[PDB]
Each structure stands twice: as structure tokens, then as C-alpha cells.
Amino acid sequence: KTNLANEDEAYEAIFGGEFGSLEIGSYIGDQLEMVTELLGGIVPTLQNIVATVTLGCRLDLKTVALHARNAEYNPKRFAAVIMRIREPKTTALIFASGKMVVTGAKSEDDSKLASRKYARIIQKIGFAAKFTDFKIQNIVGSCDVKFPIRLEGLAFSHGTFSSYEPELFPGLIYRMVKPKIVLLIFVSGKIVLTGAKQREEIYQAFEAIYPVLSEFRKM
The missing domain is CATH 3.30.310.10 (TATA-Binding Protein)
Structure with a gap:
């Protein structure tokens, strides 16, 4: 009964794993591979940061997908647009509701900055998107x-x-x-x-x- 072409079910999936949003790479493409990628006077090091942004306006994902450069949208597989940028090398998941999830950054500044870029991209295409409700969900x-x-x-x-x-x-x-x-x-x-x-x-x-x-x- 798990439908990922549903929006309510696809967003809830990113954070509902055993390890929550640690598993976020399986929705932008193994269980063991996901973890081991996160390795590559002892002091820890940040390997990923998941943030959520509320863009504020309803979004037409066919449009977003069309005009975005590096982007993917198969609505049968997963119910969001997958957009990517090269610095800060990140990935965003952009839902029909204007909710947005932003992964890949390795600093809390890169996370906020990447997120601002995705929002501006979506505005430039032609939406009343505003960058709001930036929260860091997982580090x-x-x-x-x-x-x-x-x-x-x-x-x-x-x-x-x-x-x-x-x-x-x-x-x-x-x-x-x-x-x-x-x-x-x-x-x-x-x-x-x-x-x-x-x-x-x-x-x-x-x-x-x-x-x-x-x-x-x-x-």
C-alpha cells in the first residue's frame, strides 16, 4: 500500500526510515552502500546535512522540471522534482506543495545557501516562491x-x-x-x-x- 506517486506519502517517506533522513539517497538514485558512502586528537567531521524549506506557493512540477537545467521528474516513481546544483554540490526534492527538502551540503552555511539557490531558480522560472521556514532537519x-x-x-x-x-x-x-x-x-x-x-x-x-x-x- 506504499504509493510514492502520492505527495503526502512521498514526503513522509524521506523521514520515516529506520534512520530517518539518513536514507535520503534512496529517493534520488544498497542499504549498506548508503552508510559506507558517509565515510570517504580525534575530531568528527560533517558528512551530510538535510534541510527543509517552505517555498510558499503551489508548484506545477511539470513546469519546474521542464525549465530546470539538471533536473529529473518521473511522477510514477516518486512524487517530486529532483534538481541538482554543482556548488554547493547538493540535491533538492521539490514537491507539488512548494515544500522542499535539500540534502548534500556539508556545512550549515552550504545548506542554507544551496537552499536559497533552489528557491531563486524556481522563482526565475516564474513562481511566487519565497524562501521561508528554513530548518535543518538532520546532520x-x-x-x-x-x-x-x-x-x-x-x-x-x-x-x-x-x-x-x-x-x-x-x-x-x-x-x-x-x-x-x-x-x-x-x-x-x-x-x-x-x-x-x-x-x-x-x-x-x-x-x-x-x-x-x-x-x-x-x-
Whole structure:
């Protein structure tokens, strides 16, 4: 009963995954591939930022798709226009309602700036679009503690906060409480941090987890 040519169902899909908008690449094109792409004196690094913009006016996606340069619109597959720009290299999903979702940036400034570009593009085509309600919805961070994790022991010891689920992910899924951050922990020591609303939460989730990962070093 999942229809992605529906608008209410296609927007809700981007944020309703197991990992919410971490999975946003599957709607602009594997489960394991989506995570591992987000890797490529230890300090985390921002790998993606998902933002939402309300453009304000009803949009005719056939028109938008026609006049946009690098753009794709198959309304049977997914119910939005897929537009891309080259700097900040990003991707936007533009709905019939003027809602817009903007992914690909790696700074909070690139996210807001890219979003302003997509909005201006849509105006220039000929719409009463105004850039409003810019919110950052998710920030994905990555980390590499550069030493291997005894995941099988961390899964037992922190079973309250952990799962091993090969179907979803080949490593450990750490659901941290404060801050509410899911850490995807690889056996090699690389980590993918998601859920964050501000970058502070990425560093906090990392500072919290580094002493835990140390206790579980494989030697």
C-alpha cells in the first residue's frame, strides 16, 4: 500500500526510515552502500546535512522540471522534482506543495545557501516562491577512532542501547540517549553519527562514545 506517486506519502517517506533522513539517497538514485558512502586528537567531521524549506506557493512540477537545467521528474516513481546544483554540490526534492527538502551540503552555511539557490531558480522560472521556514532537519557526522572495536562484547555489555541487525547494517547500531544520536559503529573503528539537529550533538555523541569504544578495543 506504499504509493510514492502520492505527495503526502512521498514526503513522509524521506523521514520515516529506520534512520530517518539518513536514507535520503534512496529517493534520488544498497542499504549498506548508503552508510559506507558517509565515510570517504580525534575530531568528527560533517558528512551530510538535510534541510527543509517552505517555498510558499503551489508548484506545477511539470513546469519546474521542464525549465530546470539538471533536473529529473518521473511522477510514477516518486512524487517530486529532483534538481541538482554543482556548488554547493547538493540535491533538492521539490514537491507539488512548494515544500522542499535539500540534502548534500556539508556545512550549515552550504545548506542554507544551496537552499536559497533552489528557491531563486524556481522563482526565475516564474513562481511566487519565497524562501521561508528554513530548518535543518538532520546532520550526519562521521568519525574514525583508528582502532578496531570488539563489537561482539560491546553488544553484550551495552545491550540496553545496542543491536546487531545484519539486515539493516553489518555493524553495531548504538542508540544513544543524551544526546539522542544513533551511532553506526563499524568493526574497524569508523563511525557514522546521525539524528543530530545541531553539530554540538555530533561532538557530544562522539565524546560520550570514545571512552566506551576504548574499553572495547581489540588487541
